């Protein structure tokens, strides 16, 4: 009996940390969306009607969301997926032309600059033989003064080429699930006070993640899943100012946004098959794009982050909020899509506070672009067609990407500013619950047993 023998085990519950290609899952209503619009919903496998996540009792697991792959994988999947969509969509090669632009029909005070330039230009025809002078409307940001005529050009003309998104497509973020292969598990930190790094007591295996819709947005991140108890403020290295802070809200703060102008679209035959969607007459008043949030709730929720922040910087500390320091329009402003057009909302009004140790709304203005250069584009750009009519969207704010000032001097007055830049932060914000592991079922161990002769 004293002599022990190894006996092999198949089906042993043990895993090694891994990386692997996952795959997407979506629901039937995403295909019911039809209209040939949603990206990759079609090639994407379906979800489960009765999903199950088995809780694993008595086990702890060392998570780290700042050294994860499935957010790098996702970030990549999103960039690829998007870029494959633009291949069929028409090229605006000849739209790069010397425009002759003026201001839009308006009677505004001199201080208020003109942001809608009415531009006429020699465009191409269905026939190589001919040409056509035709006019369109452009935002001031989509053009640059070229040089007593007032002539302009599309801003991309010196940086990159341009390709018009098919209107028969949609930008709506629909929920994606990242399902593992066989013999691969995803482990889910069910602890409701986890900062994203270290041992998690409450853990569960699961095939696919939750419905993670790809909202690509700077400053405040929207429509995301929110915390269960406290407003959790997560970072890789909090002490170091170079690293950003991911704030995850507890309560949703609803923010309504809109383009008040009843814009119109005309279609211009580049020919043949090619067809540019110009911006036609503005029906009605010429107003300003903007977003509203409750000053009451913003007060309330900015009070929550401060209560949490003092747990890291001292009880007797001043924590005020300031606007962006300076940089690209991509990062100096709350960027998002709304109805199919891209927004650039001044966040100075939100981040303008001060906090001591112890009924209207916030109108915040916006800009709008059509030729966009997202994901740090370099050789290619994309013209987002005019969306006919009036546009308005309603969304919750789920989080923030804040940034602290490194001047320091041990001052109890370290202030914060909204940030963005790298878009992995957004998927980092939703994927903090998850980790991918490689299943290894072949156990070997001694029990008093010999195999027969």
């Amino acid at each position: 009996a004293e002599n022990l023998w190894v006996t092999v085990y198949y089906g042993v519950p043990v895993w090694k940390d891994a990386e692997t290609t996952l795959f997407c899952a979506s629901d039937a209503k995403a295909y019911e969306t039809e209209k040939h619009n949603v990206w990759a919903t079609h090639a994407c496998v379906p979800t489960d009607p009765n999903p199950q996540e088995i809780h694993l009792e008595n086990v702890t697991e060392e998570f780290n969301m700042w050294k994860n792959n499935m957010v790098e994988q996702m970030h990549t999947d999103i960039i690829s997926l998007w870029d494959q969509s633009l291949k069929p969509c028409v090229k605006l090669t000849p739209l790069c032309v010397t425009l002759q632009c003026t201001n839009v029909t308006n009677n505004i005070t001199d201080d208020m600059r003109g942001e809608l330039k009415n531009c006429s230009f020699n465009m191409t025809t269905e026939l190589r033989d001919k040409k056509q002078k035709v006019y369109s409307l452009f935002y001031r940001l989509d053009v640059v003064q070229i040089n007593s005529n007032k002539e302009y050009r599309l801003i991309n003309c010196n940086t990159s080429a341009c390709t018009q998104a098919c209107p028969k497509v949609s930008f709506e973020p629909i929920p994606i699930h990242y399902c593992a292969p066989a013999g691969f598990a995803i482990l889910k930190c069910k602890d409701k006070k986890f900062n994203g790094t270290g041992p998690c007591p409450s853990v569960s295996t699961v095939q696919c993640t939750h419905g993670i819709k790809p909202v690509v947005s700077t400053q405040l991140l929207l429509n995301g899943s929110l915390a269960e108890e406290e407003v959790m403020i997560r970072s890789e290295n909090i002490t170091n100012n170079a690293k950003n802070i991911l704030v995850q809200f507890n309560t949703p703060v609803q923010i309504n946004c809109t383009r008040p102008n009843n814009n119109t679209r005309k279609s211009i035959r580049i020919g043949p098959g090619q067809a540019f969607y110009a911006t036609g007459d503005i029906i009605g008043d010429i107003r300003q794009a903007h977003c509203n949030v409750s000053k009451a709730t913003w007060n309330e929720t900015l009070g929550k982050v401060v209560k949490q922040l003092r747990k890291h910087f001292g009880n007797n500390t001043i924590i005020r909020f300031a606007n962006s320091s300076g940089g690209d329009l991509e990062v100096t402003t709350h960027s998002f899509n709304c109805g199919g057009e891209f927004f650039y909302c001044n966040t100075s009004g939100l981040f303008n506070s001060t906090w001591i140790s112890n009924n209207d709304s916030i109108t915040l203005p916006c800009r709008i672009k059509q030729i966009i250069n997202m994901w740090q584009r370099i050789g290619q750009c994309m013209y987002a067609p005019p969306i006919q009519g009036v546009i308005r969207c309603v969304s919750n704010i789920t989080g923030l990407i804040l940034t602290r000032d490194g001047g320091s001097t041990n001052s109890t007055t370290e202030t914060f500013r909204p940030g963005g830049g790298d878009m992995r932060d957004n998927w980092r914000s939703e994927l903090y619950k998850y980790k991918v592991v490689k299943i290894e079922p072949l156990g070997v161990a001694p029990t008093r047993c010999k195999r027969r002769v």
């Binding site: 170079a242 320091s325 690209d328 490194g406 790298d422």
Partner: protein, 128 residues
């Protein structure tokens, strides 16, 4: 091989601003922050700030805020599109700003953080 090349030494009068350039090449310029740091005689190193080239987001040392501005320009050469230049402008100079200014970049290994600077420009001496 990563290379950071700065503009030459300069003499500045008090009240002046100095603009220092740092041409960065041998890697994808958008993928890494550039920091600026100054080595001051008899006082040692002082971190000035960083810039992230994608959006040009910046962070300035609290004690220098109001006197420093960082910007960048990305290559416009179609067959050589991945290098760029980082600029730092430092204003309201006094003799106490007489120092050697460096642009620096982190290492690109898995355990390399943001502040260990593996790559250094040759430095720019500014005498005020």
């Amino acid at each position: 091989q990563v290379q950071l090349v700065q503009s030459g030494a300069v003499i500045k009068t008090p009240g002046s601003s100095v603009k220092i350039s740092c041409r960065a090449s041998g890697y994808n310029f958008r993928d890494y922050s550039i920091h600026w740091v100054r080595l001051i005689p008899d006082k040692g190193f002082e971190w000035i700030g960083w810039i992230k080239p994608l959006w040009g987001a910046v962070s300035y040392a609290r004690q220098l805020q109001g006197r420093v501005s960082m910007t960048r320009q990305l290559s416009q050469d179609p067959d050589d599109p991945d290098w760029g230049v980082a600029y730092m402008e430092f204003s309201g100079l006094t003799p106490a700003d007489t120092a050697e200014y460096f642009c620096v970049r982190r290492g690109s290994c898995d355990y390399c953080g943001d502040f260990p600077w593996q790559y250094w420009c040759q430095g720019t001496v500014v005498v005020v």
